RNA sequence: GGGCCACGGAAACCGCGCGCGGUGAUCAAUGAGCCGCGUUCGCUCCCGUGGCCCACAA
RNA sequence: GAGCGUGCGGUUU
């Protein structure tokens, strides 16, 4: 799997990520698309970044993990970009997604953040 | 863009899996490039990790 | 599968005793990096988006070059092989511009046609075609004839036809697809195009993206790592691989760089099958590109004779001080 | 004289397209629409000016 | 100046 995917993510954790975006969307604030997600991280407003595992070409999202580590922001992967798009509430695929305000999903976000900490 | 090619075979195809080698195909066109290149620095950090440099 | 530039060439020996002095000249992989660039060519994978001219304007500015020229212009939406010759190598493009090209194209048919028919009709387009350059054109919009060397259909998916095509320089691909559409009755247009080959420049490990090009430049400039950027740049000699060659003695080299025509007693080796008037590359025994020229004799005449002008020297690439003035 | 090399044989604005920054879309988030700013390579002849050579390889 | 190469097309001077 692609070289920008830095660690292995279990299906359960991956499902928790797609659920967290589902909730944070209507009850909080998210940003959807790679430019929006990237800005969020540079602006330091991203709480969690979710990156699709099937981005081609890689270069679309390849810069995110290093930029996240630079800004001290947690990131995690999900297998599908179409599925990540659906979660973001758009009818198109999304290569990456940022959570700016978690809303009714604060604890799930904090849970995700602490298990990817061991994987880092 | 619909044109794909197998990273193994080199075969051009419209399919997701190479009809020759059997490998997962990639989009044939290279990624878009900006002279401004906003994330070159961070892309370079990823690439340095990849290249053993 | 075959372009004219693919022909097999037998190297023939005139002077078996000719040796080269290792103190003289700079064979490709021995050139310090800065000299390498001075006499270099990039096998660029052009991205869709910018024009070919913009892409080179970016290359010049990022690599800090005074000059660079590209071969046959690719359209904004077209990706693929774009040779970019740098600095003192810029004029070698003239060996490229006229050489054959290959494309992978996706044609969209405007009506349903059986797969058997599509292959049949496209096969009929191999050979000469008459066309007029389109409105969006860098060239005089007059009628002209051009060769299609081959067409290979790779895949048909309903109304989409994916194919490879080999063509003479100056062949317009949109126009060709339009005429295939008319031959099929239903009409057609081109939805996607990629150049896979220009002369000696192919899709191999030398083919490099803008990203890798600028990144490797920075690894060199800013990290001190020479390896990657070095492989990013090809010696100008590459731009001459498809040409018939004659290899010359050390004692003829400086003269030729000073604009002497090449006489038979300067020849050490040559390719078989050179005819009068053919474009030839004049090489050192270290396989350095000295000059481009025009054959005044055939391969067999150069081989059989002991005096007379073998090659008219027209374009000199090698600096005058690489070999001593032995005359 | 000839050959070769170099330099010159237009500039400044405009558009289409493409990009960056901003915002971010009733299936283009791998970026819609809008705003602001950016944005186009050489070669061959030929002619002009200058430079190096005149070298059958010894 | 005249041309070439899949991309340019305008308006002043
Ligand atoms: K062409």
DSSP letter for each residue of C55-87: HHHHHHHHHT-S-EEESSPPPTT-EEEEEEEEG
Structure tokens at C220: 């060199």
Beta-carbon neighbours within 5 Å of ion ligand 1: C 171
**Residue C131: which of C197, C185, C76, C179 has the closest Cα?**
C179
> For B29, which of C194, C210, C214 is closest by C-beta distance?
C194
Of the candidates A64, C61, C80, the residue with the CA atom closest to the CA atom of residue B38: A64
Identify the experimental approach.
X-ray
How close, in Å, is residue C69 to chain B by CA atoms? 18
Distance CA A13 to C1' E13 in A = 69
Among C199, C205, C188, C146, residue whose Cα is nearest residue C171: C146
Say whether residue A59 is in contact with chain B using an 8 A CB cutoff. Answer: yes
> Residue C175 C-alpha to ligand 1 middle, in angstroms?
10
Helical spans, DSSP H, in chain C: 33-38, 52-63, 93-96, 115-123, 173-183, 210-223, 227-232, 250-257, 299-304
Q: Is C207 helix (H, G, I), strand (E, B) or coil?
A: coil
Structural domain of residue B48, as residue ranges?
A: 1-53
> Shortest Cα distance from A64 to chain B (angstroms)?
8
Distance CA C46, CA C42 (A): 11
Experimental structure resolution, Å: 2.3
User: C97, C79, C89: which is closest to C41 by C-alpha?
Assistant: C89
**Closest to A61 (Cα-Cα) out of A120, A7, A3:** A3
A33 to chain B, any CB pair closer than 8 A? The answer is no
Instruction: Name the nucleotide nearest C78; use CA and C1'.
Output: E6
Question: What size, in residues, is chain B?
Answer: 53
> Is the distance between the Cβ of C70 and the closest atom of strand E smaller than 7 Å?
yes
Q: At what angle do helices C210-223 and B40-50 cross, to 10 degrees?
A: 80
Mutation target to probe the B interface, by most B beta carbons within 10 A, among C55, C57, C60, C162 is C162
**Rounded distance in angstroms from the CA atom of residue C140 to the C1' atom of nucleotide E2:** 12
| Residue B33 to residue C48, Cβ atoms within 8 A | no
Which is it for strands C245-248 and C279-284: parallel, antiparallel or unpaired? Answer: parallel
User: Chain B: residue nearest A71 by CA?
Assistant: B42
Q: How far apart are CA C1 and CA C153, in angstroms?
A: 12
ω into A57 cis (within 30 of 0): yes
Q: Which residue is nearest to nucleotide D43 (CA to C1')?
A: C94
Listed in order, strand segments (DSSP E) in chain A are 29-32, 48-52, 75-78, 96-101
Whole-angstrom Cα distance, residue C23 to residue C58? 37
Q: Note the residue count of chain A.
A: 120
The alpha carbon of residue C267 is apart from the nearest alpha carbon of chain B, in Å, by 41
Backbone dihedral angles phi then psi of residue C192, each to the nearest 5 degrees: -165, 140
Q: How far apart are CA B43 and CA C62, in angstroms?
A: 17
- Chain D positions within 7 A of any protein Cβ atom are 2-7, 17-31, 39-45, 52-58
Cβ atoms of residues A87 and A45 within 8 Å: no
- With beta carbons less than 8 A apart as the criterion, state whether C257 and C318 touch: yes
Choose among C45, A39, A95, A49: nearest CA to B5: C45
State the CATH architecture for C1-31+236-327: Roll (2.30)
Sorted by where each begins, the domain ranges of chain A are 1-120
DSSP state of C110: S
Q: Helix C115-123 to helix C173-183 angle, to the nearest 10 degrees?
A: 120
CB contact under 8 A, A63 and B46: yes
Of C155, C240, C314, the C-alpha closest to B28 is C155
DSSP state of C206: T
d(CA C147, CA A1): 44
Give the nearest partner residue to B28 out of C194, C210, C211, using CB atoms. C194
- Structurally, what CATH architecture does the domain formed by C32-235 represent? 2-Layer Sandwich (3.30)
Report the candidate in C76, C50, C79 with the shortest Cα–Cα distance to residue B2. C79
Residue of A nearest to B45 (CA): A66
Sign of CA dihedral A77, A83, A85, A86: negative
Q: From the CA of B34, how many Å to the nearest CA of chain C?
A: 9
Lookup: tokens for C252: 């003829």
Q: Determine the CATH number of domain A1-120.
A: 3.30.1330.30
Nucleic strand D near CB of residue C169 (< 7 Å):
no
> How far apart, in whole angstroms, are the C-alpha atoms of residue C301 and residue C309?
11
In whole angstroms, what is the distance from residue A31 CA to residue A29 CA?
A: 7
The Cα–Cα gap between C284 and C295 comes to: 17
Q: Which nucleotide is nearest to C177 (CA to C1')?
A: E6
- Taking Cα atoms as reference points, which of C139, C127, C149, C98 lies closest to residue C279? C98
Alpha-carbon Rg of chain B, whole angstroms? 15
Report CA(C56)–ligand 1 centroid distance (Å): 19
**Would you put residue C262 in left (φ > 0), alpha (ψ -120 to 50) or beta?**
beta
| Breakpoints of chain A, after residues (C–N > 2.5 Å) | none
Beta-carbon count within 10 A of C18 CB: 18
Phi, psi of C144 (to 5 degrees): -160, 160
Residue C250, number of CB atoms within 10 A of its CB: 20
> Where do the DSSP E strands lie in B6-44?
12-13, 26-27
Cα separation values, B42 from A62, A119, B14, C76, C181, Å: 8, 21, 32, 27, 47
Which of B10, B19, B53 comes nearest C219 by C-beta? B53
Q: Rounded to whole angstroms, how far apart are CA atoms B5 and B14?
A: 8
Contacts made by residues C10-13, CB under 8 angstroms, sequence distance 24+? C10/C271, C10/C272, C10/C273, C11/C269, C11/C270, C11/C271, C11/C272, C12/C269, C12/C270, C12/C271, C12/C272, C12/C299, C12/C303, C13/C268, C13/C269
- Please give the torsion angle defined by the CA atoms of residues C70, C74, C80 and C86, in that order, rounded to the nearest 10 degrees: 10
* Option in B14, B40, B47 nearest C155 (CB): B14
Count of CB pairs separated by less than 8 Å, B with C: 72
The total number of structural domains in chain B stands at 1
Specify the pairing of strand C160-167 against strand C68-70: unpaired
CATH code for the domain of B13: 2.20.28.40
Q: Tell me the CB-side half-sphere exposure of residue A20, using CA atoms within 13 A.
A: 29
Where do the CATH 2.30.130.10 domains begin and end in chain C? 1-31+236-327
């Amino acid at each position: 799997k692609p070289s920008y995917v830095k660690f292995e993510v279990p299906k359960e954790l991956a499902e928790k990520a797609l659920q967290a975006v589902e909730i944070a969307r209507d009850t909080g604030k998210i940003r959807k698309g790679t430019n929006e997600t990237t800005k969020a991280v540079e602006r330091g407003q991203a709480k969690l970044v979710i990156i699709a595992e099937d981005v081609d070409p890689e270069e679309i999202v390849a810069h995110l993990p290093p930029l996240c580590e630079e800004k001290e922001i947690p990131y995690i992967y999900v297998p599908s970009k179409k599925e990540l798009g659906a979660a973001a509430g758009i009818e198109v695929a999304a290569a990456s997604v940022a959570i700016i305000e978690p809303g009714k999903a604060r604890d799930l976000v904090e849970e995700i953040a602490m298990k990817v900490k061991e994987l880092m | 863009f619909r044109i794909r090619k197998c990273p193994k075979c080199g075969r051009y195809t419209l399919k997701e899996v190479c009809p020759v080698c059997g490998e997962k195909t990639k989009v044939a066109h290279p990624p878009r490039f900006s002279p401004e290149d906003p994330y070159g620095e961070y892309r370079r950090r990823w690439k340095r990790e990849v290249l053993g440099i | 599968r075959i372009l004219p530039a693919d022909i097999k060439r037998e190297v023939l020996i005139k002077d078996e005793n000719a040796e080269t002095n290792p103190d003289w000249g700079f064979p490709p992989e021995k050139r310090p990096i800065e000299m390498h660039i001075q006499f270099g060519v990039i096998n660029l994978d052009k991205p869709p988006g910018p024009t070919s001219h913009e892409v080179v304007a970016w290359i010049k500015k990022i690599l800090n070059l005074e000059k660079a020229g590209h071969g046959g212009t690719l359209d904004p939406k077209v990706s693929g092989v774009l040779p970019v010759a740098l600095e003192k190598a810029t004029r070698v493009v003239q060996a490229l511009l006229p050489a054959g090209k290959e494309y992978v194209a996706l044609m969209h048919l405007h009506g349903d046609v059986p797969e058997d028919k599509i292959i049949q009709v496209m096969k009929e387009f191999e050979g000469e075609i008459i066309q007029r350059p389109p409105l969006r054109s860098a060239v005089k919009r007059r009628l002209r004839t051009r060769k299609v060397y081959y067409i290979e259909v790779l895949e048909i998916e309903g109304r989409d036809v994916l194919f490879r095509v080999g063509v003479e320089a100056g062949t317009y691909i949109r126009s060709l697809i339009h005429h295939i559409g008319l031959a099929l009755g239903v009409g057609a247009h081109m939805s996607e195009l990629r150049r896979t080959r220009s002369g000696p420049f192919k899709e191999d490990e030398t083919l490099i993206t803008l990203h890798d090009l600028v990144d490797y430049y920075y690894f060199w400039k800013e990290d001190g790592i020479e390896e990657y950027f070095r492989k990013a740049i090809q010696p100008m000699e590459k731009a001459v691989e498809h040409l018939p060659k004659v290899w010359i003695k050390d004692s003829a080299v400086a003269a030729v760089t000073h604009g002497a025509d090449l006489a038979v007693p300067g020849i050490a080796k040559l390719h078989a099958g050179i005819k009068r008037g053919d474009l030839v590359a004049i090489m050192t025994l270290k396989d350095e590109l000295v000059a481009l020229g025009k054959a005044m004799m055939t391969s067999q005449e150069m081989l059989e004779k002991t005096k007379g002008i073998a090659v008219d020297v027209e374009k000199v690439f090698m600096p005058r001080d690489w070999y001593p003035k032995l005359w």
